[PDB]
């Protein structure tokens, strides 16, 4: 069969709106979970709307567009996936409207093109890095708002200020001034001192360990001190005089190589011990494996396999031995750990988290994990823009007297263009039980005196970034709120969106065999 | 239910679809079939929507705001009735969101609070300055004629336009003082003006009326019942007793009309009219006396002839008081429009006048009836009305933008309403364009990027599409158009997208 | 298909309130029972809601996940499955009307009932009365309930005692502020599993503390009494155990060493071998091998309580030991719950009419949005004792009034009597329930009637 | 189950009436089979024009016309809360509570709401009939009809009340406001600004003659003749022929000389108004033009007992006898011209103080000019019910009556014992219908203004004195607001005698409803 005309771009519209709708109710966080039941009988529960798509059935030809448009954005972003399927949705609503006032789908198309590349240009005008570091606070509100559904939340605002402070200092060059935020760092201890509000902030590498014997100093070499990073033990080795005369050697490269710090994963014997007293060394038994590994990034050393490299037997003095200053230790309750400050260069930091009861610091650790990924993805791109609403809502009112400056038959596609993008903080606010005709309503006037003396490089009472907060139910920056959303999701997100729209009305004919 | 309320909205669609092309004077004509079989066409929304008797509950408040526009205003009949249906359709999809019906009702009065305060503000009175009397009424006129076949020949038909209004009083006018008769034949440039009344010319019998048509000063007088002996129609039927008195039966009308025959010449009134049919009896004795008479004449044109000299109507010939009797300055009656048309002329006392007007066809002539009519209304309303805005889209563009930014600054669900209403607005000069056969899209937009730069009196060329000022295109309304449809528009829009409920009881 | 707009709503209340009206009649000692009509000429003639909830077969996916509740819900106590499944869709019932006529968004209502949680918890508790945990012959009549009227009634004597010491066993008592509570650390399933011997006594059946095997020694001539015998599983050790089998051959090469060599031995028992020993054997209580019951044993058992073992079950034939297994696991769940807190809960509805009381007055001095749903939770916790009032052939308009104006003057222990039918004291009656049955109703009722409401579209693909 | 569904074909007229109150209201359209259109806002006239096929739903009609026959207003409260009584006694009798309980417990919960009345009341209307004090009683009942007019025609109604009414105070035996004193007339043209009050009635018709009008002479006679203008002749048959030429100069001059005789001793008598219910003859109108006598015909007899209480006229059987005893006397009569058109009024001075008057209504739209004479007639009945029966006392109206009902209700559900508990609670739910009718028909979201409501009513105060505001009702809104606001600011209040009688009306309409489980009909 073969068809055209009007009946093609009724099923266009059809079409989507079904697809909307499974990505209505599943927009932001406040989005509630579906099940998909398929003729087997079998079905499955998730919260996530990329998952859905992927095995949504749907016959039509612009249906299957979306798929592989849903799928080009888990690839790469894995986030926005369910806002690029509603801004797609919108736009082919508003363009079958224009086939009653005679408007050619040309027009429409390089009318989104010239828009496109102009909103850019505007979006990049109002972009800003991470700011208001004094005297107001951003990255606090991000972790509070992610700790609310559990029992840290109440004292993630003394927690917070630990976490900032510490991942502020961890940026470093990387390759030529990459300025990347690892992604694993900041190694979490904890102990049973005091009370859970008591945790001080460690600036510096902290090791969770004893001192053994007692008989040696807890605090040596103030001015200059080296660590010694050994995986192989300084204990009489076994199988599974010839033992005991190799170990004798392997001590004496160390006291002649001026290392203060000997750090030992399966111990140190109590023959080798000896020597350490009247050297002032400071022994370690057993050592974690995991946590030697990064001091010698954090510290500058290097990881030592074993000491029977080649034909011969020392530790390589000066070639592994670190620049710190001095390291130094506190007595601390339950568990005593150890403070390493002054290295060469290290950059990062230890938080050790102390509570009434390890089953409660169980929980409070795994979520600072989960509350620091957030912020770590966000801090990982240098040029972050406000989310909510605030690139949807800033466009749409710039866009009205902007299409003048243009014209030529192209004034009608840039306004529906950009009444298209106020679906996003409409169908947002559905789940969050709030009325959406009274929050886009408002939303617009306090953006309209805002563009006014804009331009005018002057203001009184004009302030820019206006978000939504659906959780308090009132309008407040998203940049304090804790809300905020890298520029390389949005752009490619909104530019993705309008390709798979271009594609859909350039089809006037459906042949199917 | 709710969907008896998209129901309604729907069905004031399909009338006002008919009447877009209705808009503006080059704009498409609705022919109507009436049940009486008469067919009639006009320009005239007024006229227009009377005919459609619509079943529906709801398309009875366009014909009721019709009437009103039509008697208070009189022009604008078919700009009031869009402007009303298009904010109904530009509301159709904030229902289907769950928006309340009342919100948006409401929202609508809001922007005519502000409305009102406009055209004030846009009401400019001048009167003397930079104008004149003929001059004021000569550029006036060749603005309603212009983009017609008649503006070639428009040189001409100005000389007359002014003279129209002039021979009236200028505090009180009226557009039907001034009759229009469609006479086929002869060149469209040969019509002149005329005071008086004209006839039809019904007798196409040929064999007497011998009689010079130059009179010097005739004597008028009204007759309300018919004076006659011979008769086409009728006839009377003769049975007696007798062979010799089968004539003295039909003659009992002889002796109260022989006398009645006299009584004119010694009143000496020298026209004699009757809403009847007359028959050859009263034009025999008329002819020595040079009195003229015209049979068959309607009832419309004696209502005119009645307040040209101020007589009155008598319904016998004896009583007739001297009072009743009128004088005129001069009676000719002249071969233009390819036959003789009697007309009266130099009535002092004249209330009232008509226009003739010729051409090849009488569709032609009746195309220049209704244009004629619209240069009448405007000047209609330039006199009582000192207050005179720019028309022709010009204040309508206007209106929108300001209501645009005042939504800015007006927090709440009233902003999205005030800028819908403000949008509603231009489908007045969009209709226009597509009319005439301009472009729309590019109009509209082109329009828009000048009315932003301060100057207020932009409006719309109706000659040559491009964007201009109607100050120099001559384009005048007065500012009760302005202030009356808004106010008729919001009351019947908010009177129908109320109705949640469509009752018809049958019987 | 696909089901939008407000019709999918109603679709997702009908799915899981239909399940449960039916399953109403399972409830309590005088539950009526129920015939299904399988293709196959036979029937299933008993009354249990766990085994016919499994043999129905369901369009809608919200009866699904309600099936997968009541799975959970067997395996935490051996009774209670119904009442969860007619809680959870009742409430649904009562937020119909809100949900639809009234308009009232879906996470208001989920948002309320989580509210509402907490406030139904901390009732409950003030109505428990205090318990003592360490009376052996309180526990008795504790299980007792889940004892008579059954084929154990016989062996109750013996049975009381056996399901006792079952319990004792497994249970640890230790608490302090510095690593928390542990819970005692109690499972059911694996350390609480049971293995059946034929033969031999109930009476005489004793719980040991270890891993029993049936293999001997494999050497004819050797020491049977080991001092500090040492388990070694896979220094010179006392015993070698070996998973798979072992030759002849090296038996006389371990022969001198002075250890036995043991083979043949399960994988999943190796797990608990590691809480006796720590294995991945010092300290072990006894070795002794000696036969009884015509079956060679051994002692793995020590000094030490790792909570985790083996129970062996004698009897007088493997027919009697079957019914047992069934009957002692439904009974240890009740006494587990007594040691999760010293509380014991009024029987017989009293709990439930116990948290409508208290809602409905706290809920008008919040002021809120919130206030309308608490009202249909309320009357949703009264549906459960006036269920057994239908069921009991008393006035259901009548009793429920009537039980709901004792409350304000009397305590809120009294309940409803399945034997008599009119209104009576659960305490002095000795009627008693416990409180974690009625901890878990509550909060898995309400947490599975969120995630119904969650749904407002049915998506058709794979 | 014929008794749920039967309620479910209520409720199908039930959302007709919730679109009626409030300002939201509309008048709705009915063509008769006669082709005759009538146009009303009231719900009770728009019953009368509507076909009624069910006999359950001629029930509440039945009990709505009981509303607009003794206190005329209310007829929307008592069908609205009606039909929400039997909405929430559906749960009742599907929950296995029988019918029989639920009808006991409305009398019991009737008994205790008629007796908390008298505490509830907030004013007390003096009934001084000043101007002033009238705006107070008038503006609720203009409010939720017609918006936008309640301003202009407060002024109207209440200046044409004062001027019916005699002084006196503090005396109910002998009643003197009637529901006939105040008539309502339309004309084409004009506007509401430009209407004035008039002390008479106004009569829109032409004169037929040619004086215009009277002079301006004390204590004018008008005289009301049945009979008409006419020869004296025999009472049966009497036509008068003419057989011959030669009778006719005697009977054309006789019919003349007769009718001036007659004419004569009128005019001396000092009457200088004729008002002849029956045509007049061509002869008689020329001796009238001469004397200087207003010509008037009336043929409607209704307007005759109205016009008999003002002057005293008296109608006579006979013509010629102007008998000194029965005619009236009215002190100024005048003819202006009103709304375009030059008509002949009837209004008085100082004495001869009229007990019926007329407002003239003026504007350019038909469908609302219908409109405000319907709502005329609803603020009628309002003057009426300032009488003996609860007159002076008021309670505070828009919402606020029927959810402060609901404290005081639930508050003797529990200490009534037994199962009436049951009826007691729902009978206080229902009137939450109320204040939910008035915030969805205006666009106002339930989860803002409802819980408002709810928290106005119930607060936290330390002590036994009630304090803070009590007399929030609901809010229509139409500009901005934040949560409610105080009533007693634009002073919207109800009178005691229309809810008082409301709730007894509402209460037995349900009670029928609800008492019958099995309907019999046959085809007619």
């Known amino acids: 069969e073969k068809i055209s005309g009007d009946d093609i771009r009724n099923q266009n519209v059809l079409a989507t709106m079904a697809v909307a709708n499974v990505v209505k109710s599943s927009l932001g966080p406040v989005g509630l979970d579906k099940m998909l039941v398929d003729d087997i009988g079998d079905f499955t529960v998730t919260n996530d709307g990329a998952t859905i798509l992927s095995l949504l059935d749907v016959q039509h030809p612009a249906g299957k567009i979306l798929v592989e448009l849903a799928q080009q954005q888990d690839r790469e972003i894995g986030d926005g996936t369910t806002s690029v399927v509603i801004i797609a949705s919108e736009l082919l609503k508003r363009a079958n409207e224009l086939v009653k006032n005679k408007i050619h789908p040309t027009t429409i198309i390089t009318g989104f093109r010239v828009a496109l590349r102009e909103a850019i240009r505007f979006i990049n005008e109002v972009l800003s890095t991470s700011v208001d570091t004094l005297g107001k606070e951003t990255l606090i509100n991000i972790a509070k708002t992610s700790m609310s559904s559990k029992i840290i939340g109440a004292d993630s605002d003394f927690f917070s200020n630990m976490v900032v402070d510490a991942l502020l200092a961890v940026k470093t060059q990387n390759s030529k001034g990459e300025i990347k935020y690892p992604v694993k760092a900041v190694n979490v201890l904890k102990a049973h001192g005091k009370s859970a509000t008591e945790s001080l902030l460690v600036p510096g590498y902290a090791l969770n360990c004893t001192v053994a014997s007692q008989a040696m100093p807890k605090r040596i070499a103030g001015g200059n001190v080296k660590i010694a990073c050994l995986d192989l033990n300084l204990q009489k080795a076994r199988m599974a005089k010839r033992e005991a005369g190799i170990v004798l050697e392997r001590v004496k490269k160390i006291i002649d190589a001026g290392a203060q710090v000997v750090l030992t994963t399966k111990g140190i014997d109590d023959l080798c011990l000896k020597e350490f007293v009247e050297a002032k060394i400071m022994g370690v038994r057993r050592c974690k494996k995991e946590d030697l590994r990064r001091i010698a990034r954090a510290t500058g050393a290097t990881l030592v396999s074993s000491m029977s490299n080649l034909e011969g037997e020392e530790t390589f003095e000066s070639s592994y031995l670190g620049l710190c200053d001095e390291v130094v230790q506190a007595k601390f309750s339950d568990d005593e750990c150890i403070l390493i400050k002054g290295t060469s260069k290290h950059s990062s930091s230890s938080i050790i988290l102390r509570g009434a009861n390890d089953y409660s610091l169980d929980e409070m650790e795994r979520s600072l994990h989960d509350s620091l990924s957030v912020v770590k993805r966000t801090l990982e791109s240098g040029n972050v823009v406000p989310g909510g609403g605030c690139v949807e809502a800033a466009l749409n009112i710039y866009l009205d007297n902007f299409a003048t400056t243009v014209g030529s038959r192209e004034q009608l596609a840039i306004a529906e263009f950009a009444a298209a993008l106020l679906i996003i903080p409409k169908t947002l606010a559905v789940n969050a039980a709030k009325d959406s005709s009274e929050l886009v309503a408002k939303l617009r006037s306090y953006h309209a005196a805002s563009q006014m003396a804009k331009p005018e490089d002057v203001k009184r009472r004009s302030y820019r970034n206006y978000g939504l907060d659906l959780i308090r139910g009132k309008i407040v920056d998203e940049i304090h709120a804790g809300v905020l959303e890298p520029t390389i999701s949005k752009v490619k997100s909104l530019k993705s969106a309008l390709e798979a729209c271009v594609a859909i009305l350039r089809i006037d004919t459906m042949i199917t065999v | 239910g709710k969907g008896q309320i998209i129901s309604n909205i729907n069905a004031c669609v399909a009338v006002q679809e008919a009447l877009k092309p209705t808009l503006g004077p080059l704009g498409s004509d609705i022919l109507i079939v009436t049940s009486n079989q008469k067919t009639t066409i006009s320009n005239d929304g007024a006229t227009i929507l009377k005919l459609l008797d619509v079943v529906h509950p709801a398309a009875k408040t366009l014909v009721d705001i019709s009437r ?424 019947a829009t908010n009177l129908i997208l109320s109705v949640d409920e469509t009752i018809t009881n049958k019987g | 298909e696909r089901t939008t707009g407000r019709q999918a709503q109603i679709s997702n209340i009908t799915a899981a309130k239909a399940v449960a009206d039916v399953i109403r009649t399972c409830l309590g000692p005088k539950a009526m029972l129920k015939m299904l009509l399988d293709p196959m000429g036979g029937l299933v003639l008993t009354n249990d809601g766990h085994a016919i909830l499994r043999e129905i077969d369901v369009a809608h996916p919200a009866a699904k996940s309600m099936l997968e509740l009541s799975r959970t819900q067997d395996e935490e106590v051996g009774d209670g499955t119904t009442t969860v499944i007619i809680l959870a869709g009742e409430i649904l019932a009562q937020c119909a009307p809100y949900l639809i006529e009234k308009n009232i968004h879906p996470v208001i209502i989920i948002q309320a009932l989580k509210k509402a949680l907490t406030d139904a918890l901390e009732v409950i508790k003030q109505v428990s009365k205090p318990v003592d945990v360490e009376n052996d012959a309180a526990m008795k009549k504790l299980i007792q309930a889940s004892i008579g009227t059954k084929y154990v009634i016989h062996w109750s004597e013996k049975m009381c005692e056996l399901a006792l010491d079952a319990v004792k066993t497994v249970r640890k008592d230790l608490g302090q502020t510095v690593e928390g509570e542990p819970n005692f650390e109690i499972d059911i399933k694996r350390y609480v599993r049971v293995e059946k011997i034929p033969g031999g006594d109930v009476l005489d059946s004793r719980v040991l503390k270890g891993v029993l095997l049936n293999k001997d020694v494999v050497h004819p001539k050797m020491s049977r009494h080991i001092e500090n015998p040492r388990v070694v599983l896979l220094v010179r050790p006392t015993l070698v155990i070996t998973e798979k089998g072992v030759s002849d051959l090296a038996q006389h090469y371990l022969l001198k060493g002075g250890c036995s060599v043991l083979r043949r031995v399960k994988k999943s028992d190796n797990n608990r071998i590691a809480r006796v020993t720590g294995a991945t054997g010092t300290n072990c209580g006894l070795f002794k091998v000696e036969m009884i019951g015509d079956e060679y044993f051994s002692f793995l058992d020590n000094c030490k309580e790792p909570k985790a073992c083996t129970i062996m079950l004698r009897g007088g034939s493997k027919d009697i030991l079957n019914e047992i297994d069934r009957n002692l696991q439904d009974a240890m769940a009740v006494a587990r719950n007594v040691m999760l807190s010293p509380s014991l809960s009024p029987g017989g509805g009293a709990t439930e009419m116990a948290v409508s009381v208290k809602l409905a007055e706290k809920a008008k001095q919040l002021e809120g949005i919130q206030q309308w749903p608490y009202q249909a939770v309320a009357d949703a916790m009264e549906c459960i004792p006036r269920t057994l009032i239908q069921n009991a052939g008393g006035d259901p308009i009548r009793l429920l009034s009537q039980l709901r104006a004792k409350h304000a003057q009397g305590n809120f222990t009294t309940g409803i009597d399945g034997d008599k039918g009119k209104i009576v004291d659960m305490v002095s009656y000795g009627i008693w329930e416990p409180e974690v049955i009625k901890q878990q109703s509550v909060k898995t009722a309400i947490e599975s009637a969120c995630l119904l409401l969650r749904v407002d579209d049915i998506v058709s693909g794979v | ?110 008994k205790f709401t008629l007796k908390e009345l008298d505490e509830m009341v907030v004013g007390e209307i003096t009934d001084k009939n000043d101007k002033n004090e009238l705006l107070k009683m008038i503006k609720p009942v203009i409010s939720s009809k017609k918006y936008g007019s309640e301003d202009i025609l407060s002024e109207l109604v209440s200046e044409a009340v004062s001027h019916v009414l005699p002084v006196a105070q503090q005396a109910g035996e002998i009643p003197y406001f009637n529901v006939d004193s105040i008539r309502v007339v339309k004309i084409m043209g004009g506007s509401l600004s430009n209407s004035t009050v008039i002390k008479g009635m106004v009569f829109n018709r032409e004169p037929e003659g040619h004086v215009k009008s009277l002079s301006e002479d004390k204590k004018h006679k008008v005289a009301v003749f049945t009979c008409p203008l006419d020869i004296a002749n025999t009472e049966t048959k009497g036509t008068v022929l003419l057989h011959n030429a030669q009778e006719m100069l005697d009977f054309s001059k006789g019919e003349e000389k007769q009718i001036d005789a007659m004419m004569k001793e009128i005019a001396d008598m000092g009457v200088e108004c004729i008002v002849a219910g029956a045509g007049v003859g061509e002869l008689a109108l020329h001796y009238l033009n001469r004397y200087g006598i207003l010509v008037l015909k009336v043929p409607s007899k209704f307007e005759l007992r109205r016009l008999c209480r003002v002057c005293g006229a008296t109608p006579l059987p006979r013509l010629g006898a102007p008998t000194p005893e029965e005619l009236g006397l009215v002190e100024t009569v005048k003819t202006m011209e009103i709304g375009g058109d030059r008509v002949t009024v009837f209004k008085q001075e100082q004495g001869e103080i009229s007990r019926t008057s007329t407002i003239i209504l003026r504007g350019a739209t038909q469908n609302n000019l219908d409109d405000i004479e319907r709502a005329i007639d609803d603020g009628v009945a309002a003057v009426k019910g300032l009488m003996k029966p609860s007159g002076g006392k008021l309670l505070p109206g828009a919402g606020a009556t029927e959810i402060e009902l609901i404290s005081r209700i639930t508050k003797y559900g529990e200490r009534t014992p037994g199962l009436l508990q049951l009826a007691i609670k729902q009978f206080a739910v229902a009137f939450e219908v109320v204040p939910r009718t008035l915030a969805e028909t205006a666009g106002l979201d339930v989860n803002e203004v409802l819980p408002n409501l709810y928290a106005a009513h119930n607060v936290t105060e330390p002590g036994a004195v009630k304090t803070d505001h009590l007399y929030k009702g609901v809010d229509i809104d139409g500009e901005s607001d934040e949560g409610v606001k105080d009533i007693r600011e634009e002073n919207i209040y109800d009178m005691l005698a229309t809810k008082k009688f409301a709730i007894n009306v509402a209460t037995e309409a349900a009670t029928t409803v609800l008492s019958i489980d099995q309907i019999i009909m046959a085809k007619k």
């Open chain 4, 1 to 110: 189950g014929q008794i749920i569904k039967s309620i479910a074909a209520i409720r199908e007229l039930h959302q007709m009436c919730l679109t009626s109150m409030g300002p939201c209201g509309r008048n709705k359209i009915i063509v008769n089979h006669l082709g005759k259109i009538i146009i009303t806002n009231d719900a009770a006239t728009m019953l009368r024009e509507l076909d009624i096929v069910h006999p359950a739903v001629k029930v509440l009609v039945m009990a709505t016309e009981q509303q607009k026959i003794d206190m005329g207003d209310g007829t929307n409260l008592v069908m609205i809360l009606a039909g929400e009584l039997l909405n929430v006694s559906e749960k009742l009798i599907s929950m296995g509570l029988s019918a029989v309980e639920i009808i006991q417990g409305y009398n019991m919960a009737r």
């Open chain 2, 68 to 491: 009103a526009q039509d008697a208070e205003v009189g022009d604008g009949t078919t700009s009031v009735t869009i402007l009303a249906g298009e904010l109904m359709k530009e509301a159709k999809p904030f229902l289907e969101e769950g928006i309340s019906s009342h919100l948006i009702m409401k929202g609508y009065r809001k922007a005519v609070s502000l409305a009102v305060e406009k055209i004030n503000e846009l009401a400019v009175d001048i009167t003397s300055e930079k104008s004149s009397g003929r001059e004021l009424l000569e550029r006036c006129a060749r603005t309603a004629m212009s983009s017609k076949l008649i503006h070639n020949n428009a040189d001409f038909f100005v000389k007359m336009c002014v003279d129209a209004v002039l021979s009236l009083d200028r505090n009180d006018l009226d557009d039907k003082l001034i009759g229009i008769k469609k006479i086929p034949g002869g060149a469209m440039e040969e019509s002149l003006f005329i005071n008086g009344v004209a006839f039809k010319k019904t007798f196409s019998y040929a064999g007497f009326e011998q009689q010079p048509k130059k009179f010097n000063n005739p004597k008028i007088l009204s007759l309300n019942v018919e004076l006659e002996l011979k008769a086409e129609k009728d006839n009377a039927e003769v049975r007696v007793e007798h062979v010799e008195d089968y004539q003295a039966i039909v003659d009992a009308e002889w002796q109260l009309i022989f006398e009645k025959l006299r009584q004119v010449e010694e009143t000496g009134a020298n026209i004699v009219l009757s809403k009847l049919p007359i028959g050859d009896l009263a034009t025999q004795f008329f002819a020595d006396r040079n009195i003229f008479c015209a049979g068959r004449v309607s009832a419309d044109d004696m209502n005119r002839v009645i307040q040209a000299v101020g007589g009155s109507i008598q319904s016998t010939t004896s009583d007739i008081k001297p009072e009743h009797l009128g004088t005129c300055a001069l009676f000719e009656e002249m071969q233009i429009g390819s036959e003789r048309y009697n007309l009266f002329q130099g009535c002092p006392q004249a209330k009232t006048c008509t226009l003739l007007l010729r051409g090849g066809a009488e569709q032609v002539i009746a195309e220049v009836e209704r244009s004629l009519h619209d240069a009448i209304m405007i000047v209609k309303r330039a006199l009582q009305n000192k207050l005179i805005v720019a028309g022709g889209g010009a204040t309508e563009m206007e209106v929108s933008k300001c209501l645009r930014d005042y939504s800015k600054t007006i927090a709440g669900k009233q902003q999205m309403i005030i800028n819908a209403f403000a949008k509603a607005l231009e489908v007045i000069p969009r209709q226009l364009c597509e009319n005439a056969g301009f472009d729309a899209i590019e109009i509209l937009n082109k329009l828009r990027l000048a009315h932003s730069k301060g100057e207020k009196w932009y409006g719309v060329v109706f000659e040559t599409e491009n964007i201009g000022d109607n100050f120099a295109k001559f384009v005048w309304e007065p500012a009760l158009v302005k202030i009356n449809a808004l106010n008729s528009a919001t009351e």
